[PDB]
Design an enzyme around this catalytic site. Structure first.
Site, mmCIF file in Angstrom:
data_model
loop_
_atom_site.group_PDB
_atom_site.id
_atom_site.type_symbol
_atom_site.label_atom_id
_atom_site.label_comp_id
_atom_site.label_asym_id
_atom_site.label_seq_id
_atom_site.Cartn_x
_atom_site.Cartn_y
_atom_site.Cartn_z
ATOM 1 N N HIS A 1 -5.532 8.429 49.689
ATOM 2 C CA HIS A 1 -5.288 7.347 48.736
ATOM 3 C C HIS A 1 -4.795 6.054 49.400
ATOM 4 O O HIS A 1 -4.496 5.071 48.718
ATOM 5 C CB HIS A 1 -4.326 7.813 47.636
ATOM 6 C CG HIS A 1 -2.881 7.802 48.034
ATOM 7 N ND1 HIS A 1 -1.861 7.779 47.107
ATOM 8 C CD2 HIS A 1 -2.284 7.800 49.249
ATOM 9 C CE1 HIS A 1 -0.698 7.776 47.735
ATOM 10 N NE2 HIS A 1 -0.928 7.786 49.035
ATOM 11 N N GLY B 1 10.340 11.716 49.286
ATOM 12 C CA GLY B 1 8.954 11.946 49.668
ATOM 13 C C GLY B 1 8.207 10.632 49.757
ATOM 14 O O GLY B 1 7.743 10.109 48.744
ATOM 15 N N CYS C 1 4.892 9.080 51.022
ATOM 16 C CA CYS C 1 3.534 9.535 51.330
ATOM 17 C C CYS C 1 3.258 9.643 52.819
ATOM 18 O O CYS C 1 3.354 8.656 53.556
ATOM 19 C CB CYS C 1 2.503 8.615 50.676
ATOM 20 S SG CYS C 1 2.873 8.193 48.968
#
Lengths: 300, 299
Positions: A41, A143, A145
């Site tokens: 992404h 978190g 990415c």
């Protein structure tokens, strides 16, 4: 607390972190040998995430469409392929800090360490479990990415996770190191809901044994319950069913202490009914479920 | 934020060695050409009842200590004693020595510990120095010689080394200078510990963290004074809030848009009435191992 939820020493992974830039979007990457693993992404813009046709967008890119950087050192990327939800970037230099590694897919209820990385640079390490609803709990940095989850067995790092998406309420959804998601999530900014998240009974039981080994015994009783009786009460207080497959796993801890599974299950039952009532187990006032039987034995 | 995470220990892992003397083996800090470890390794199980470190060290030669890094065993060419620590000079400067500092931290501040079993780094966790100058744990949650540290850019600020396990289950240590925190001494005996209060400053910082993250069901229109707050705080075992504390939260207070004293009246209600079974940042119980500096770092 009398029992610390310990992450693995993040050294062997720290040297594997890079930043991956495509256009304006920038996130973490895992550099192993001559390949950089990162979420796919990355090639999407803020607009493209609404409904992304990745193969349609990735073809519009080339090797030079990618800024990969290890600290101050810049890496020349000489190839790119797509594997599920991961981006596979072939680079001109091989990683001299590469530890002895393996790729694994962990089970729900199993634990690992996450090295949260801020734009290629590591920021902190924490320990967690893959919740029954296939999610990881977290926040703004917990978190980022590209940040990876791992276990370290002696000198072998077994990567099992990569942060991809942040759900509505600080819930993190990610993928294995093959690009296959965990549970029913997808890499696109739309409406995604978490399932009914439950308390991992197996891990809690291990923690009560961990408790016992450290002297804590006040919760233990004479009553002995059946497996079927327990699951009734378990489901009542939002606890994961105890399978016969589970009791086999507690065997070693059961042997160690001479306390049969079901007897410990009659102890948990009373703890669910009544609670601590002023008391503590291993410094905590709540029942911890993020310690797998493996973790306990390893740390005791 | 949600998770109590520690600093990446990569730079510290390469500084860990084991030190064997007699029948005892513990963890040691290898920086440059020196090695640092709990001076009590030189003692036996009996010696620890009433140890005399001067007398015990005097009939110890350089050979008595065995220091190995992973496998490569270091030759110890000198041994001094700084306070409660052993300073063993070895024939080699640590090739993996990072930029480092030694600091002595205030009770209620946070740091990462690298627990180690005989040189080998086991796990890593984040903790706060309890107000009574202790750290909770098990046997492996910091086997002696294990180090506490913080990380500021290039520099590693070491602040703690484990020395003693107390009866209660808590741990006492020193700064990397050798001076204990609290009224603790490196001899096997009973040790009167201070009352372990709840770190008010940290709870408040953690409540600001919640607001920032869009979790604000515990806010009210109620008000309080610093004076009125502490009389509720003292009763629920929270240590008194000071003006100094109110100043530290200033930046957070601006950012969030909520004044420090109102956040206290927000706390006042949670201490008196409980949480109704709700969650602040996925937690059922109030957390106090996050400093104001920690909260800002993780946003």
């Amino acid at each position: 607390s009398g029992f610390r939820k310990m992450a693995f020493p993040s050294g062997k992974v720290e040297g594997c972190m890079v930043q991956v830039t495509c256009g304006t979007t920038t996130l973490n990457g895992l550099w192993l040998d001559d390949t950089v693993y990162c979420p796919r992404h990355v090639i999407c813009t803020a607009e493209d995430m609404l409904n992304p046709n990745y193969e349609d967008l990735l073809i519009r890119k080339s090797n030079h469409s990618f800024l990969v950087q290890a600290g101050n050192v810049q890496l020349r990327v000489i190839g790119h392929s797509m594997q599920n939800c991961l981006l596979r970037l072939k680079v001109d230099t091989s990683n001299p800090k590469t530890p002895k590694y393996k790729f694994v897919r962990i089970q729900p209820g199993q634990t690992f360490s996450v090295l949260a990385c801020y734009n290629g640079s590591p920021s902190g390490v924490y320990q967690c479990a893959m919740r029954p609803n296939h999610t990881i709990k977290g926040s703004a940095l917990n978190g980022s990415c590209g940040s990876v989850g791992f276990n370290i067995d002696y000198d072998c790092v077994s990567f099992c996770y990569m942060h991809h998406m942040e759900l509505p309420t600080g819930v993190h959804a990610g993928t294995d190191l093959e690009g296959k998601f965990y549970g029913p999530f997808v890499d696109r900014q739309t409406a995604q809901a978490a399932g009914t998240d439950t308390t991992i009974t197996l891990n809690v039981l291990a923690w009560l044994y961990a408790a016992v080994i450290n002297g804590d015994r006040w919760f233990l009783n004479r009553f002995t319950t059946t497996l079927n009786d327990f699951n009734l009460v378990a489901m009542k207080y939002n606890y994961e069913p105890l399978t016969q497959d589970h009791v086999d796993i507690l065997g070693p801890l059961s042997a160690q202490t001479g306390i049969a599974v079901l007897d410990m299950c009659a102890a948990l039952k009373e703890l669910l009914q009544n609670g601590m009532n002023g008391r503590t187990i291993l410094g905590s006032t709540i029942l911890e479920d993020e310690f797998t039987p493996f973790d306990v034995v390893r740390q005791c």
